[PDB]
Amino acid sequence: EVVGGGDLGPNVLVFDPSTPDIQGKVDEVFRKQESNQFGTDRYALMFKPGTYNDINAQIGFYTSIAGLGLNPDDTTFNGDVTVDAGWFDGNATQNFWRSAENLALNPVNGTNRWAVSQAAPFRRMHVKGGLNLAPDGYGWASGGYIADSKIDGEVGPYSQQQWYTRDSSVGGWGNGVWNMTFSGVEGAPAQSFPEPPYTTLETTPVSREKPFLYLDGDDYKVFVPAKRTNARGTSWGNGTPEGESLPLDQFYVVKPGATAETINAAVDQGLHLLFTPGVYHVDQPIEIDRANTVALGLGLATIIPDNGVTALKVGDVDGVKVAGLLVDAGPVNSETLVEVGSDGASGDHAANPTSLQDVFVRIGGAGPGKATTSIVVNSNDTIIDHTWVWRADHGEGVGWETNRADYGVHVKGDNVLATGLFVEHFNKYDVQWSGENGKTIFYQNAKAYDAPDQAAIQNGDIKGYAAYKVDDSVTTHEGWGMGSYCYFNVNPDIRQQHGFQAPVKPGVKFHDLLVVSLGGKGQYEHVINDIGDPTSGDTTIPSQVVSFP
């Protein structure tokens, strides 16, 4: 019974090079979206191919900006896509929930400013000049994620604490701070941790670029890249990229209105999903149990699970590409928010894996919300390529109980790969890995700030719960470029035994680990298990470990 394609709706603004009032108009969204951290408004600015002049697209909360060509240079700005921190007094550590993709940029002073923190991906971009990742004045910042991009000149992180870059091309990298990690990046600074703190891998073992809306001439369509093993450099610049096109008309177009039963019925029926920029309350989980289903969000499209249900469940099928969505906890506790595969699933998905890309989870912050576990990854071979799983530390509806969320991510399948894993503030283990031969490239954690007292975070004989816990049974794991920080702002007497916990086996390895106390609010006793120096002083110097075991 459902109906494919049709109309993307008001919240998706489709600019062209003869379109009137682009500056003034891109400027109204920012005005309302600049300081709008928890609003329900959602926007995507989409630009048709061509060259656009005298422009500076300033990007606020819940704003995605993109070109609608196939290769990034089809849509060129003699101008800038700018993220700054004027609204929060130079501090960029709340510059969340926005994105830029599939544009070239010829920045007006020779350098584009993308001063963001978490959940602010920069994908499929060509910067014909510099890329400055810090707010004007080298004030605080906690990014960040760049993939499938070419920066002609220098990337300058400056004050950025940490960063992940994959499968890209840079002609310079200026500096590290705590953890600037690279995989498959031509031009990456040579590996050197802790000095500078560069963790560098030549290729990404597998990656698959995120699907995106484009105009194959007159028609709305989505292009869906195929996977690369040992990816290095960009995917677009040599000629005809690799992967499929879907016509629009083979997508259900979800808008304000949609029930979860119709969304699933459209996937029953053989349609893909395109979530328009909106907030979707669902009282049954969204279910994708058809191989190769693309589920693509625009304008930070957001799902909220009502009645304590799970928001999104992927079945044990090959090739599901979930991209560009925020799952936002309801006030009724959900046992899970996202499940990838059913519990127990023992099959392969190796040739054609399921992935989550730019999938973000929030618990609290916009009022009261809670979940026991946020993401369960049951399916073997799953790719998690950019996720921010975040128990709110600030905002409305936040308490050590009021927005309690015990567990962030739990990985149970085998062969699972996370590139750009950001997980923070959970009451217990932020990340748990139970499956075999897991790989994590780049991890950023901060522990819960609102732990009341030592006794509240006790873990048998461990003080605190690891930010990242590989199970005792696991025989095979390997991780690179991983940091956990603490700011026990309620009770800075607290001690966190470690950032990491894992068995001591010849084939469970870690490379370039660090923990950091933020201005002496709590301290780490060790880095991993019982190994590594404690943090000390209020000077926020990392305690580091190059190699383990």
Ligand X SMILES: OC[C@H]1O[C@@H](O[C@@H]2[C@@H](O)[C@H](O[C@@H]3[C@@H](O)[C@H](O[C@@H]4[C@@H](O)[C@H](O)O[C@H](CO)[C@H]4O)O[C@H](CO)[C@H]3O)O[C@H](CO)[C@H]2O)[C@H](O)[C@@H](O)[C@@H]1O
Q: Smallest distance, Å, CB 92 to ligand X?
A: 9
Q: Is 159 in the site for ligand X (CB under 6 A)?
A: yes
Q: Which stretch binds ligand X (CB under 6 A): 29-37, 138-146, 336-344, 460-468?
A: 138-146
Sheet with 243-247, strands from edge to edge, namely 212-215, 220-225, 243-247
Q: Which of 446, 448, 451, 467 binds ligand X (CB under 6 A)?
A: 446
For the bound state, the minimum distance from the C-beta of residue 113 to ligand BGC, rounded and expressed in Å, comes to 4
Measure the CA–CA gap between 340 and 355, rounded to whole angstroms: 9
- Restricting to residues 160-179, which ones interact with ligand X according to CB under 6 A? 161, 177
Three-class SS state of 260: helix
Whether the CB-CB separation of 336 and 312 falls below 8 Å is answered with: no
Answer yes or no whether residue 84 interacts with ligand BGC by CB under 6 A: yes
Asked if 374 touches ligand X (CB under 6 A), the answer is no
State which amino acid sits at residue 331: P
Q: Which does 82 bind (CB under 5 to 8 A by kind): ligand X, ligand BGC, none?
A: ligand BGC
Does 82 bind ligand BGC (CB under 6 A)? Our answer is yes
* Among ligand X, ligand BGC, none, residue 378 binds (CB under 5-8 Å by kind): none
Using the rule CB under 6 A, is 56 a contact of ligand BGC? Answer: yes
The answer to whether residue 55 forms part of the interface with ligand BGC (CB under 6 A) is no
Q: How many residues bind ligand BGC (CB under 6 A)?
A: 10
30 binds ligand X (CB under 6 A): no
Between CA 32 and CA 376 the distance in angstroms is: 35
Q: Output the CA–CA distances (angstroms, integers) from residue 407 to 417, 418, 466, in the order listed.
A: 19, 17, 11
Q: Which is nearer to ligand X, 21 or 396 (CB)?
A: 396
Binds ligand X (CB under 6 A): choice among 11, 99, 142, 183: 142
Euclidean distance between CA atoms 98 and 122, whole angstroms: 9
Query: Buried b / exposed e across 387-418, counting CB within 10 Å, b at 16+?
Result: bbbbbbbeeebbeeeebbbbbbbbbbbbbbbb
Other C-beta atoms lying within 10 Å of the C-beta of residue 96: 22
314 CB contacts (<8 Å, ≥6 apart)?
A: 287, 288, 289, 320, 322, 339, 340, 341, 354, 379
Region binding ligand BGC by CB under 6 A among candidate stretches 109-117, 378-386, 395-403, 416-424: 109-117
Instruction: Please state whether 102 falls in left (phi above 0), alpha (psi between -120 and 50) or beta.
Output: left
**Using an 8 Å Cβ cutoff, are 404 and 397 in contact?**
no
Among 136, 244, 283, 530, contact with ligand BGC (rule: CB under 6 A) = 136
- Taking a C-beta distance cutoff of 8 angstroms, is the pair 139, 90 a contact? yes
Alpha-carbon span 528 to 114, nearest angstrom: 33
Residues 333-372 that bind ligand X (CB under 6 A): none
Residues 6 or more apart whose CB falls under 8 angstroms from that of 337 comprise 305, 310, 311, 312, 327, 329, 361, 371, 373, 374, 375
Name which position in 80, 316, 358, 424 contacts ligand BGC (CB under 6 A): 80
Binding-site string for ligand X from residue 89 to residue 108, where x marks contact by CB under 6 A and - marks none: ----x---------------
**Among ligand X, ligand BGC, none, what does residue 354 contact (CB within 5–8 Å per kind)?**
none
Q: Of 76-84, 91-99, 151-159, 504-512, which segment contacts ligand BGC by CB under 6 A?
A: 76-84
Residue 109 or 230 with smaller CB distance to ligand BGC: 109
Task: Tell me if 380 contacts ligand X by CB under 6 A.
Answer: no
Query: 30 in helix, strand or coil?
Result: helix
Contact positions vs ligand X (CB under 6 A): 93, 138, 140, 142, 159, 161, 177, 393-394, 424, 446, 487, 518-519, 540
- Please give the residue ranges that form the binding site for ligand BGC (CB under 6 A): 56, 80, 82, 84, 107-109, 111, 113, 136
